[PDB]
Write a protein that binds this DNA or RNA. Sequence first.
RNA 1: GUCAAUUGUUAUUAUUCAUAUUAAUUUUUUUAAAAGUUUUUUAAUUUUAUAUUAGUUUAUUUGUUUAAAAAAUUCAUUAUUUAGGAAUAGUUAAUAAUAAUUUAUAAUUCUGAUUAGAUUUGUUUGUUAAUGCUAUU
Lengths: 125, 252, 328, 189, 150, 116, 103, 95, 62, 267
Amino acid sequence: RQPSYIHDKRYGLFSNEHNIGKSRRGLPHITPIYTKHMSLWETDTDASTNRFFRHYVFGQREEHLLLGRPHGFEADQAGGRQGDSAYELNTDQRYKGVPRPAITNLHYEPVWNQTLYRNTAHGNQ
Amino acid sequence: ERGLYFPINHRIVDQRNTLGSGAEEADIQSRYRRQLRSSFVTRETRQTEPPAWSRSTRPTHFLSLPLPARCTLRVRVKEMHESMIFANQSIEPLLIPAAKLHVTLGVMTIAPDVLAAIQDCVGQACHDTCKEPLQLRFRGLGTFAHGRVLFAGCITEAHFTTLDTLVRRIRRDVGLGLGVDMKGNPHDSYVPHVTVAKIRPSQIGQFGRQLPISMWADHQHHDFGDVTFNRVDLCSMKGEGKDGYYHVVSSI
Amino acid sequence: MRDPSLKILRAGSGFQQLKRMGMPFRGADTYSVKYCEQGRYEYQRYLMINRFPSEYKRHFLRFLGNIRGSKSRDAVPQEALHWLLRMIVDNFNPQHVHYIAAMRTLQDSGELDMARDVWKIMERQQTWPDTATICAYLDVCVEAGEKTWAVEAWNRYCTELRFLQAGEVDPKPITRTPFSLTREELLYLPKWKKHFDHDPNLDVPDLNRFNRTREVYLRMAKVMLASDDMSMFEHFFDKLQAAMLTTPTPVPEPPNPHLVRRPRWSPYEHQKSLHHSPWRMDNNGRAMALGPSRTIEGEMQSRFFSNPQFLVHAVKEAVAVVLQRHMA
Amino acid sequence: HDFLGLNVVSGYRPSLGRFLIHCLSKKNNISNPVSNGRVLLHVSTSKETLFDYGDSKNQVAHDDSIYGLPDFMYVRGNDIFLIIIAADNHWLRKRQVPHTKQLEGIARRCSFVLGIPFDKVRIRNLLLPPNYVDSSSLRRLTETVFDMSPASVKEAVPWISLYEKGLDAQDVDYCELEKTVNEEEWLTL
Amino acid sequence: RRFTESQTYPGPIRAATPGDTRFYMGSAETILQENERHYVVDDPHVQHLVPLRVRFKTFIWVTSGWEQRVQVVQVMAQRDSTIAELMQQVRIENQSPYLCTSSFKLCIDGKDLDELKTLADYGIHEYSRIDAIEENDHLLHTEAERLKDW
Amino acid sequence: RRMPWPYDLTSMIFNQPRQGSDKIGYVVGTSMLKTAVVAANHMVYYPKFNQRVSRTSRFFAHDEDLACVEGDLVHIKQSRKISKYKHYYVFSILEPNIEGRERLKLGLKAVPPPLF
Amino acid sequence: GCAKVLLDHGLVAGFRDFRNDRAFAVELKYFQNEPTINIIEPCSYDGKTEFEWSPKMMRRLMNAHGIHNRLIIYICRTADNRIIDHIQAVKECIGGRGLMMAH
Amino acid sequence: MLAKYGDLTVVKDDLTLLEKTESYIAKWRLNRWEFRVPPLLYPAVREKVMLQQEILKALCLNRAEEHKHVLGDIQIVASITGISPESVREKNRAW
Amino acid sequence: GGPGSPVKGPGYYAPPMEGEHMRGYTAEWRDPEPWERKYKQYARGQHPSYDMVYAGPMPEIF
Amino acid sequence: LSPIQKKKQEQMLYGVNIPETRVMRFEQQHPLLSTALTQLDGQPKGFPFWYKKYPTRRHAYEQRFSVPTEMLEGYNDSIKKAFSMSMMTIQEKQFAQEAMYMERYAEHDFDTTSPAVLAVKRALKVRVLRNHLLTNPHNNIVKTILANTERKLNHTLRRLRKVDFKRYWEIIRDHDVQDVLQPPNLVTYRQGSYWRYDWNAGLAISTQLADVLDPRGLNGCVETGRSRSEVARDLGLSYTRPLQENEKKQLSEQAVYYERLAKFKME
RNA sequence: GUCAAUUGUUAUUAUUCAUAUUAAUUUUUUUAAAAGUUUUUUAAUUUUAUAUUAGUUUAUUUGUUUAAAAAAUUCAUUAUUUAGGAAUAGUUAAUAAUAAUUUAUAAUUCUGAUUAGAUUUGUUUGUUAAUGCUAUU
């Protein structure tokens, strides 16, 4: 079975007990637990990582059927896709949308991310 | 059973009222939904609010597309005017002179060198763009300044897209390029409109704050007809109807 | 007869597996040795969660409620730091209100090093703190008495801060349009570019609009004054002086209603009288009967001052430390 | 700033026009800039028209692959030079190279309008790298196309020797374009 | 009052005195459709219609015996209005017949309000405490107060 | 057995704060006031067949300025309960039926009437 | 890509990409006047279903009762759109959808 | 453009101010390049302006790192030869 | 720690296509002891291997 | 047929000539030819100067067999009559009307797959097919292609209207082939399948909104969550369908109510 | 990165289908079980809130202090059975703390609604090598 720590990370640490404290809860149909492997999440993961998105016939098909992407029942691109659409082909999407988040800099300049406390200064010396 | 046991009127909470005081000291009452009325039901639209320091100063010049006569706009709104002086003769001192009906685009507080540079600028801002004769289809009346102004609401259907760039094109230049004050200083899109009515500041004591809803509740969404605009005009508002129109000092 | 390998290889997404995915023999020998290799928390991937537009604020308030509420009586001074972590652990990027709420609560509780920890966290989170936040950390640096801290934070974040010159316009109007997606950007840009959690560095462009630059040079001169490094203090306070007199009054910033207790409508007729009990005269919410437990100078925040008054106040704020420097 | 290709948008073509004027201003007159629109000529009848016709880098893709399009046309007299900023497209690039029919097509048409003798029309080409400019280009430009007294080159262009942009390997083939086989107009463009 | 006593200076100093500023439509946003704000950080200030609290007194027939509770009406007040309009303005928002049984003169702390004055002369804001007294304040002490069932 | 398939169009384009938070669909009905009926696709995946089919449903959404004309592509989201059946609001319209506005500008209905 | 894989396993003599859009040519190879490709079958009899293969779902096939058995060849289209045989597919331990089998 | 930067100091070898100005840019961490975009600009340029900022952002790191080791590259000589890090910049092959 | 492991991330940083700098692309790589001869051969793959695959039958001698 | 549809058949009986749009294009583009063509008038002209006039061989429809009217001048009038639009078989009279109309809407003169052209090519065929079918009522062979032609009609129209409704109105108004466009039924319209057809075609997002309804209001803020309208309200833009009277009268009342409250509760 | 593995003696052939095992009713004394809840000064008042019914498939949803103990809500999306199939009806929406006779014509329904029949809505079983079939409050 899936573990339960999946619940916390998606919603919140210890979000469980607060929800349990409901007066009319669990009777008769409880709100079940969101235990879904982190790579299988509906929202966060893209197509290249979530295998289910790689479905085509009723999945990626409608997308390219909407976006205008030249799409076939099977082809060279990821999911039933042959070539870019007129929009993708003509417009620059490097810096469109959310600005490049500052925390990216943490990668190339890694001195910032440093354990402030000695792991042994927790009480286990 | 017939009405909801706790209808929406019992499904309202307010933050100014301290939840825990108005709920836990005594019963609060207020016609809340009247306060939450959307700006669509009222047609109160947010034109650019000028900086308070500019609010003491009064508008001197205006750049505006003067309405072409014979167009469907007037013969529909002049049909409204006669319909309104019919409803209330009191609207006649309030009404905008049907001679002076025109699209109001920009308010500037200017003297001649200021006129000449913009004359070059709008003479270029149009020529930088080289737009074709604009056609703006008006529809739906609305209110500025908490009702003190009633204007021809300009829908964004026909040609507004190439237009509202013109606003931002001069506004970038006339405001920040050279030193010309405007009410809408920061590059801002000034809602272009034809003021069908306007309460004078002196008249506010005469007729009240709010131009009556019952006066324009009939044609709140009347369709005022597309008009083809070809010439932009910069004008001073010092006079009234110099040629049936205010004093002209530029055009294009 | 259909292949048995097919009869297995066909139903790979068999609802039995679906349960084990959670979509709706056993000794240590079998489990791989490569298990013990994964370093601490490397197994976790990135997580980009979008929360409800409202619940972005509610969740922030509860965090804002604990931090500025931790130092009540029971919760440890440290607790203010522990709530900042529980937010960040769950990917709610910690906004500037939750930073100031920590440094304020921590300083009030005599915790100075921990007050810096909150500052390093926002140095770790790579969140550029606005001027209002920059002065905050310098304030603990005053209690910390370290020139080595403020000088460090000085170069990194508040380098280009310049006094409002007489010719410059005034506190800048809001320029950051809220994040809005044209349908083109929405349909074609990938998921990772279409997720928006309020990054604290987004409004920092406009979080500097009210031009609190003057409070900076004072807090820095204060630190230079605290660490006996008066050689730096003069150059700062002199540069503060000459500009405090010529530059216009920096427009004071209205109080942020998220941080401060904004008052709220209330029927004050159902209030216990001052002599509600026969035994003692009480101080009711409406009227004060015992009087002020503290002598109050009655003056508003230093930012509400004029341009000169701040300067002479800067002397009062400076010499108060010269007291504490000696008194410490 | 443009010649070094740092202008990632609208790369160096208009600035190239300025340079050619400056390369030609110091050549004869500082009061030269007679820009009657697209034509920027010299009047001494030793004609040095610097007529720029259109933007090859940004028009040959969208319409009418008129290879003859000289992003700049600088006649020197008998020699009729063409300066074309080569398209980044390896494909359209061979639809910027003027072809034999276009060469003698222009030459027989410039002899009339400019009075240049029919025999002495010597039309030539020069295509710069697509996005940046190289150091050899500036030299062979100021040495052959815009024939310049070498001392005056230091005067008109002081930073010529200081220029260091060397052709990146990827875009060395910017020049080596081949004529399509006469029988393959279907497959090749 | 610390928040309010603070923002008292942004009144003049933020908007009135600065001969230079701009106010930018767009990125100057409004309230949501999830019944709440949306977590942005600024506003100089403005309130054209100041919501005025007007508290009343009316009896309700409790099961044991009559008792009077505090029915407060929260009315929107034009900051440039005269009180005579206010008394006229408020009467329509009763929502309960038992409130505006007859004429009533609005009152502050027992000191009656002068109708020919505006809210500026009296300096009434939201936190101003405006009771509401009916004409029969002399009554309801006399034995004809109200008739209960025994 | 027919289990709900979250991975779909609306899931792949939009990060859904929770299940079915936002939806996208065509404006089938604008007869009612401030309420644009939309038909959107919620997926069901059959583990038996191993093939998944689409079951299209009808949702109501609230458009304030009556901006949604018949035949538009709207990107709605969930919200507080407005009525017994409205809990959606038209967050944005992607594809406006230009004809629908113009065919109304002529004075007709935004779509020719159905046959049966 | 499939014929590219079958070729390297030898079930076919040799493919050729004529770059024709419609169809390319693959040379069958016979032994004992018996075709090398005894049973070749497409994994998904229907296009609507596209079965994906865990790196363990393939690995179980290589073991026929305790002997590492590479007799059958399964083709997998990796997420990176690399047409890969099940043998290499478990080598770098990556999954993909299942196109067909051959043995 | 030009009119703004107008104060003139002709006492500058091509290297000194640059090598000096480089040092300040050398110590620059990445976040220094965060808010350099002019705010109120069109999506037509709010795209194109960000790109050009990334090019300069690229080149500075180039002139920073590729010169960073150069000082060490000079120092390798000083640590071996024992001469000033300055004079190495002029020592020849014959040396 | 297989392929589903969170991406380790790139090493360098080259923002544009218009990334033009010679003397670059050399800054990515900047590469006593008695090693045993055989192993330094085997470590470089030049050493003749002997897999289990070159094993015949284990014959019954006794 | 119906009043609008038969209006075209009148233009079929006596035929249709070239529109002046083609003959004027040829002039303003090739001056030496038009000067040469009007110079050789009436004379038997031995060189086809008017070759650029009629690019596609089917672009010649004024006379029979696509014989261009210019070739006929040098002969006796007896010949010019035998090839007149009067003496055409009906099977040509369609190709005369078709090649005429399809020329008018041809964005690309040589193209025969432009959704405007492909529309009219079938659209006119449907009429004369209906013209036939109703006259002699029972002909199964004709009825089947009527299903095939309407399918290629709707597949063209529902695709066309997204390209440009302006041209599109001419295809529907002038021929009144709207009847096949009217949604098939309520179910296929209720579940959206009538609208989803534009999706299943791929022309969902193909408008280039810069023409109408400037997108500065069609996109609610993702940061804020504001609905579509609020971002127009905050920008002062209006995006409203021209209301029906059904929604007009109900909107008048909503605007007067809390004012009407000032009417009733003064009593 | 350690466990998928199929056992009927048939009876020309076609067609899952009599006599098999597993799990169940048959099948039997080893887990229940009776009354009087209990306070309190006031004939009173504090404290003493969901097994067992009747008929439901667009269905059932939630707490201000009660307790704890020293500004969190009334809404929702989904999934819904009958072999042979047509209408439903105190209506829908907008006003509003209207509307026993306001304003619209609206609302459900063949994408199978309403009435009628059966069934208490299922992290629970059994069978199996297993998508499945087959139970459950």
